[PDB]
């Protein structure tokens, strides 16, 4: 484990909070920096399961292009703002949650105003939602689901209320990925590869577990080659 494992990469991590994480793997034999960075980056940006808002119900309005009295924003603006809502599940078995929000009076309704739930966390309580001037009663429920990839609003078609309005969902916890390969020196061979990949996520999944899931997916996909026919 020295000519081929000590001459093979130690794996270090550098994580700041649960949004940003660099992972360094050094040293790699020439040609495997990209060979590992590219598939990992594609899997991270493609198939990391996550959670996003799936449906919205307003106690007042009857369709999408309406407006609520006492509310500065249109319903379209409300859905646009709710789209960036970031939700962390705490129980892996939990799948679908229905947050409730009630507000009145001159309230700059932010995301923190949601009623607390047992195994749900909001990593962005400062997320602006609405602006209530006076006498405006804003009661809504938001159905958030755990999924994968990107899905159009109409394709899933979730109908809990006759007045519920479905929304587009972006189930990707990963904000972005950038892997860089650099040159490292070892005593016997001058040119070796050091692969450092930086991951920005939305906080719903810490970068380390995202990396582990991507590696697991890649391994299980390589498993398909094992049985020829």
């Amino acid at each position: 484990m020295l000519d081929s494992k000590l001459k093979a990469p130690v794996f270090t991590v550098r994580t700041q909070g649960r949004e940003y994480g660099e992972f360094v793997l050094e040293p790699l034999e020439r040609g495997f920096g990209v060979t590992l960075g590219n598939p990992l980056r594609r899997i991270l940006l493609s198939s990391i399961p996550g959670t996003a808002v799936t449906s919205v119900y307003i106690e007042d309005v009857l369709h999408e292009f309406s407006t609520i009295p006492g509310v500065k924003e249109d319903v379209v603006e409300i859905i646009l703002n709710l789209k960036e809502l970031v939700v962390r599940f705490l129980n892996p078995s939990l799948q679908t949650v229905t947050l409730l929000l009630k507000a009145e009076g001159p309230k700059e309704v932010k995301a923190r105003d949601f009623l607390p739930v047992a195994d749900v966390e909001i990593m962005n309580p400062d997320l602006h939602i609405a602006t209530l001037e006076e006498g405006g009663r804003l009661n809504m429920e938001v159905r958030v689901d755990r999924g994968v990839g990107y899905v159009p609003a109409e394709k899933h078609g979730i109908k809990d209320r006759i007045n519920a309005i479905p929304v587009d969902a972006v189930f990707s916890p990963v904000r972005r990925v950038a892997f860089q390969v650099e040159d490292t020196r070892l005593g016997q061979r001058t040119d070796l590869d050091k692969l450092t990949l930086r991951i920005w996520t939305d906080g719903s999944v810490t970068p380390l577990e995202a990396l582990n899931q991507a590696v697991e997916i890649l391994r299980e996909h390589l498993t398909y080659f094992s049985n020829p026919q």
């Binding site: 594609r42 493609s46 369709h63 999408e64 292009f65 309406s66 972005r176 990925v177």
Partner: protein
């Protein structure tokens, strides 16, 4: 009658109800022969407004021999897709030919990927 559940009120469809092509929109009866306005083949969105003008004219007029009229507004949210076309301010007409996933698009050394790819040969 099963599909009539969408036609909540008398003849007119209820506001805020999603409509598909081939669905009854206004139920009009002739001599009894059914001549009902339906969603045209193609696309349909969300009904937003309905206006009914009958012989009881407050200040309105109708074409002679027409007892009443109803107009229905249907709104839909078009999103960018393959069929659509785009252009800049310099006349570089175009058509969306393929919508690529984020992973396989060209990206900077930083993780940020580019949004749109333009063919240089048009310049």
């Amino acid at each position: 009658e099963a599909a009539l559940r969408d036609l909540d009120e008398e003849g007119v469809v209820r506001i805020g109800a999603e409509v598909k092509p081939g669905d009854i929109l206004v139920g009009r009866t002739s001599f009894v022969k059914d001549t009902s306005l339906r969603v045209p083949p193609g696309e349909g969105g969300i009904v937003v407004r309905t206006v009914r003008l009958r012989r009881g004219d407050p200040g309105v007029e109708l074409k002679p021999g027409v007892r009443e009229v109803v107009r229905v507004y249907v709104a839909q949210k078009r999103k960018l897709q393959v069929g659509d076309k785009l252009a800049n301010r310099h006349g570089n007409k175009g058509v969306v030919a393929k919508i690529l996933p984020v992973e396989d698009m060209p990206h900077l050394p930083d993780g940020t990927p580019v949004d749109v790819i333009l063919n240089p040969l048009g310049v």
